[PDB]
From a paper:
Complex formation with [name]-Phe leads to increased activity at lower substrate concentrations and eliminates substrate cooperativity. Upon formation of the stimulatory complex, which implies association of phenylalanine-bound [name] to [name], only minor conformational rearrangements occur. Attachment of [name] leads to a slight twisting of the last β-strand of [name]′s β-barrel and the central α-helix in anticlockwise direction. R235A-[name] cannot be stimulated by [name]-Phe, consistent with the fact that, in the stimulatory complex, the side chain of R235 is involved in a hydrogen bonding interaction with the carbonyl oxygen of L40 of [name], which apparently is essential for complex formation. Again, conformational changes of the catalytically active [name] decamer between active [name] and the stimulatory [name]−[name]-Phe complex are small. [name] seems to help stabilize the active conformation in each of the 10 individual active sites of [name], thereby reducing the cooperativity between the active sites and allowing for independent binding of substrate.
Numbering used by the authors:
A (entry chain A), M (entry chain A): 58 to 213, 222 to 249
B (entry chain H), K (entry chain F): 1 to 83
C (entry chain E), N (entry chain E): 58 to 111, 126 to 215, 223 to 249
D (entry chain G): 1 to 84
E (entry chain D): 58 to 212, 223 to 249
F (entry chain C), G (entry chain C): 68 to 115, 128 to 213, 222 to 249
H (entry chain B), I (entry chain B): 63 to 114, 127 to 212, 222 to 249
J (entry chain I): -1 to 83
């Protein structure tokens, strides 16, 4: 995982690259509005990719709780911000997550942390959708997981919607239908 | 009755010009050619003329009145005259 | 103005800088998904900055889609422009108004400057009694809330009733 | 009091006409037939009459007051008078 | 005014020009889907310009009614379909009309007919807005008229506004109109 | 009633319809009764801080074409020691709307009836309706007393009826 | 037309109105012309992947009370090598709606006309309307061919008309 | 082809202006034959172009086309869905697909099928679904729907697609 | 008082049940005289209670009252605004003010004024504005408005208040 | 003292015209001396005389004709002067 | 220093009354019992008194000032005095 | 040029005070310490000073001018001098 | 300002207090769901009051930009999370800010940081509203500032709206009206 | 169950702990705005946890307002409860259903447990053919997004058509 030391060491290199981009676009890097942009853009890019500094096992510390009986658990409209790896332009939207636990549940804030680790990286929507679904499946061994991501790609009104259904969310259409009804 | 109030709305170049209330001198109201009316829902009668205010000012000078003040309030232009 | 030749000549320098960024973030620029990213990111950035290469009625053109780039962080800000004017002898064609919004928005900007540049360009092109420009945009610098900027010139500044009619009609 | 302020709202032809405040000459307020009141929420008392302002102006002239100025502010028409 | 006879006589000429357009775009006028297109496009264009077949005086027959007292009269959200004269591509939207009568009023369906006569022509939105306002002003001699047209130009919305008489002179009348058209 | 029924029977014949078919059998009487209900306002008489009653449902008949126009009435008034009961206000809207009308006249009649009944400082009436003989909406507005004289009273009224 | 005008003139007299007042002077003829326009469908005849046309504005007249009912028609069909032109579909809705009707009959007539014209695999028609003689909405639905036999076709249609 | 045919298109639009009863010499119509010809060429530029584990959807794609029966625009949106096997469609390529077919004289049914077939041929996926909704200028909306592969064979796949495009 | 008057209220509701043509001995009506009496006592519990630089507004306060003319509920919302001088009103105290006056047999105009006067007396502010909007069960909405102090004298203060309560 | 009163006005800004200087019954000679034109703005029920000059120029010209400013007032977006000879 | 501007807002019967700016005569400001303040966000200091304007007008007459004009602007009532 | 119009906006205690237009006496404008400018989009030039209007009134009295009238219009306070 | 060292030193004391609260409510602090709650509640409370760790002068570093000509600048619908100082229960909502600059402007992200410093404290809505307005006025010396805060108080549908108008936003009603129109 | 006596006895201990929290956050507990905060916060927390002190139709009660406290962070979560059941011989009075929601929500909770407790309480009280409970809430732990939990018992679990009718009717 990327360290805070890695960030301090690489910040001048990111700033040099952004200064070079400003000059190559025909802009004046000495004008007031651009003076500190090499460093502000470098710090913003480090923030957009801070998910490389985190690990799923570290997120899972104190994350699991137990229950004698199960129910459908959904967290919808989770705001998501990510960066397209093809063009380095943000893609933003929402994540809707559903799972039918088999005696183990994730804390609500840890589920949000799972969306954060994977979204704060250079991504493709399809990979992000699957990584969230797989992380929940591996952590809890539930009966099933469903993840739907909807996002606007700035490099392109038009929205991309990706959907992964695992376990009983794939095998039992009634479970998937209840999930899709409840995320409206 | 030394004081007089006259007024017009929206544009100064065209009437009606309001020239009196219920306690106005009816001889002066007749001299100006005014008609009496109560606008719908109002709790008072008023005297008005079709003339623009400049004509009324000229007529009031011939009756010994002078303009003391002119002011705008809302969409109303008011003149305060005195004998 | 920036030329098509300037773009072709500067493309590799932009790509080299984007490749350096990928390495400095801890990423592997040789992985399949990132191989062409230096060139795709460079081309996208050139497109976003292509702007450097370029009667008794109230007239309004509202909900003009606008795409720009914050010059402080190099992140997009997107929204709408609403334009109003009281012409004297000249009226602005819809395609020319779109070109005005495009020329200034497709640059590294601050929303305030963009708003003023559009208002001044319409004032200079038409010589009207007045111009009003309102820009509303979502700033990705924030989301990762709307900023509204307003410029009133000529009678749009001097006569509050003209400005009020404009603001009512852009709803 | 050498200066006086009188006013009316909405229409000049009809009262009430405001003719005083807490420091007004009580004798002049009684001469005008004024009543004292404090409108709900206000931090001051006022004297008012049911007469339209033109009647009040005629009465104040008989007391030695002359109109110096008349102005509109909001929906209020104000007269500033002064003893001679 | 354009006659029904003019339409019958010119329909073959319009069809010949639309067939020529089909050939000039690289299309095959003889393919099934395009066989009747020269006539259908010609009839559609005549329909979009049917406003040249009518006059304002014909619309004003039996259109005026009288009233002893006035008040504000508004007809909002009147659907409008017009053709831009610069590119021959439709511009569509809505017309909001307001007026303060001075003892004469227009029948509601007659107000709609005024929008129809001027919109069904090759137009510029600004001219259309003024023609509607002027027609009402001339017909009724009211205290004032306000007309707001909002349209999408197929070639983002354009909003044009004309205020005449007291709608221009009295901001309180114009404000009441603009508040009530929301 | 029998004269109205005879006229509706005659209309059914003048359209190219079969007045003996099941769906039209009792229509001359049902249409007569509906038209009497729509015009029952002629049988009624008016003798028998800011206050607003908004979104009062209104049903009326266009006198030019005999086709309904439907919508809402918003009423406002500044009382002078007398206030109007809600059922009496509904009766006012009913008396005038249940007639052959023009929306402008109905708007004025409601405003005048409230002014006469309460002697308030002012009254404002706004009617908004869809006209079936024409989607588009007709809005008519009458302001009396201080609602006409004081623009601030009228503005507060128009703001509060949203 | 003169018989319809005579009947509307007679109705104006049977209500307690003044047929000589300005607003009613030409009403017998204007009301006759409006009623002829509302019933012009009797003058017309039908001879002269999933496809849907939704939100088709519809205006009709209740045959029980002679009061309009207005709303929308949503049509769906699965063609078998023949497709319906948009203006012809509008003419179908017009032919049947411009008559004295009941919403159920109008719904069925539109569905049958499309089935007969195109010989498709199936047709679905949903009408939703406000009835002025009664806010509340009446919804009628006809499913023919595969729209009746295959619930998945009907469900796709009902989902796509939202 | 465009430069060579532009004067013929402009001559035809000039002829249309006279046949409608208008004056082609009036100020506002002087450049109309050329502007209308250029607009028509742009609306039909699609003839100048050629095709060369999750559910994936791209919804609300703005679409502008011209009806071939009356030569009046029809405008709306395209919603696309597919179940990929080994290939996924880049957003800009999908936009080019919609552009190529929509910028022609069309019928909504043909446009819907052409987009679905182009995605099927490009990706060889398990199935594709395409829904087009448009207003035809010649409130009422036409909705056309094409379901191919598993989108046709498996009603549960089609239902998930239709639910997710809301 | 409540315990002493409860049997008299229940006797009156029992009498009402018989006078409407209903059977007070039927299963569903057996406890109604007591339940209706308890509900009426709760709806009028306000008689058991007593009053003891910025624009500040509390909007959308839910309000439930009983019309004194017909004894049928009227329900809606209260929006309050004030310009304080030295004292500001705690949220729970404002709720108690609305509760005390609304939980009585009322007329909407009186309720609106009582809330405005209670805030004026408690805070001695520059001005107070109160707007009540309610549906009277006896779609149509009654809106009453009281403006005191600077809310009446300064139209700009009243306009800012009315704009901010949207 | 024949026709002693005059009303002039300007809108929006005091530094620039047009300045309204008359109505239908204004002195035609005084209107011609000021270089005024007659017009009826669309929808208005009256004719008016106006000049392109800012009001200060008109005031200076009217002084040379024997007029004096009695009062100046604002109403809406209009600045009005009442002059008298 | 012959001119003076004084003003009050909202109601004419009650203060505060604005009686000066940064360059006002300090002796006259002290005579009126005025205090100096800069309202939050304003780019200037002002002198004000708690008295209603009529009291200030009476005091200013005793100092040789006469009212030349009185006008309304927004919610402000202004007097222009001259000695 | 016997008449003069001066004005201020928003508050009477603070400038700028407008003191002239394009046809103003350049010597009087220089005497007041005025600068010339055209606000963006306006069809006229104006002369203005940073002083509050009371200072300008005092200066104009020393030049022989007297206030004839004072009025409010919109957010502008205007004086007419002679 | 509160330091990261202050947080580490005071965390066990906050955890001891939250453990004491759990016992005093009649709850079992040894049950699974409550085991780590003393520390999770202590860390959450430190996060809700992190504005005490910041200073307005530190936020103002590189925050000001200049312009030759001015315009109305508004940032509306800024999400706001704060803690009621009377009951220690959150109050949440939105902040709308407007200002008419006099040649100096704040960077958009710095304006958001200003809302963050003051909201992430134990507050009263009226103080928060004024602190934001005063910070902008002092930093930029603009012609005027307007701040409107709207929030739901959890300790209480019902919303509290506070409004501060300074400079020309108070003195010129037309400026205030343009602001209030544009924040709809 | 927790008694009114337990509340009176534990109030000072809660206040002492809240005072200790104020000091540990770097605040001044002696400043005017915080003087009474230990007692106000203690009373509010006791109120939030007062729950520890306590036919052939489908029947649904939807949009029941719900207020609860997250047991992991001690921060509120607020929303709505939708209840459905197919009765056999007994139907639940509206005030009793409100008491069920109140008893379980006014505790330190997790939304999943709250959902199940309400469903089990209705099942035990009525002995119906089946019960369905859906809770939707905004969690302040997150905002400083909606969590939806669903429990289906009896025929609501066994018959998907009963569950589908319930989910359709709660919109
Ligand atoms: N109501 C008048 C103004 C007015 C107020 C006071 C007296 C006279 C007139 C208007 O709005 O035009
Ligand atoms: N508040 C008064 C105006 C006013 C301001 C100052 C003094 C007197 C009156 C109105 O709106 O009518
Ligand atoms: N209608 C003018 C005001 C005015 C009213 C009365 C007479 C003259 C002018 C305006 O709004 O500017
Ligand atoms: N701003 C003042 C009006 C005013 C303008 C200019 C000078 C003095 C006062 C108000 O709204 O009340
Ligand atoms: N436009 C000025 C008013 C004004 C009108 C006419 C002349 C001068 C000034 C304002 O709004 O403040
Ligand atoms: Zn991309
Ligand atoms: Zn930025
Ligand atoms: Zn065009
Ligand atoms: Zn009609
Ligand atoms: Zn019927
Ligand atoms: Zn077509
Ligand atoms: Zn009642
Ligand atoms: Zn609290
Ligand atoms: Zn939590």
């Amino acid at each position: 995982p990327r360290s805070e030391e890695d960030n301090e060491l690489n910040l001048p290199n990111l700033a040099a690259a952004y200064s070079s981009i400003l000059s190559s676009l025909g802009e004046n890097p000495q004008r007031q509005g651009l003076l500190k942009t090499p460093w502000r853009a470098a710090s913003a890019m480090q923030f957009f990719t801070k998910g490389y500094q985190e690990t799923i096992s570290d997120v899972l510390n104190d994350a699991i709780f137990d229950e004698d009986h199960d129910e459908m658990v959904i967290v919808k409209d989770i705001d998501m911000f990510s960066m397209c790896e093809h063009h380095l332009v943000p893609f933003v939207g929402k994540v809707h997550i559903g799972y039918l636990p088999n005696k183990q549940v994730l804390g609500l804030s840890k589920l949000a942390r799972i969306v954060e680790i994977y979204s704060r990286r250079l991504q493709v929507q399809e990979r992000l959708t699957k990584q969230i679904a797989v992380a929940i499946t591996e952590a809890l061994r539930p009966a099933g997981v469903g993840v739907v991501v909807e996002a606007t790609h700035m490099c392109m009104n038009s929205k991309t919607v990706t959907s992964t259904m695992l376990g009983v969310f794939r095998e039992d259409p009634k479970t998937r239908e209840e999930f899709l009804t409840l995320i409206r | 009755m030394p004081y007089l109030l006259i007024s017009t709305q929206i544009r100064m170049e065209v009437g009606p010009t309001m020239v009196g209330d219920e306690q106005s001198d009816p001889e002066l109201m007749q001299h100006l050619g005014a008609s009496k009316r109560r606008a719908l829902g109002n709790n008072f009668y008023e005297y008005y003329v079709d003339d623009p205010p400049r004509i009324v000012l000229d007529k009031l000078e011939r009756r010994g009145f002078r303009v003391l003040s002119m002011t705008g309030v809302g969409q109303t232009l008011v003149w305060c005259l005195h004998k």
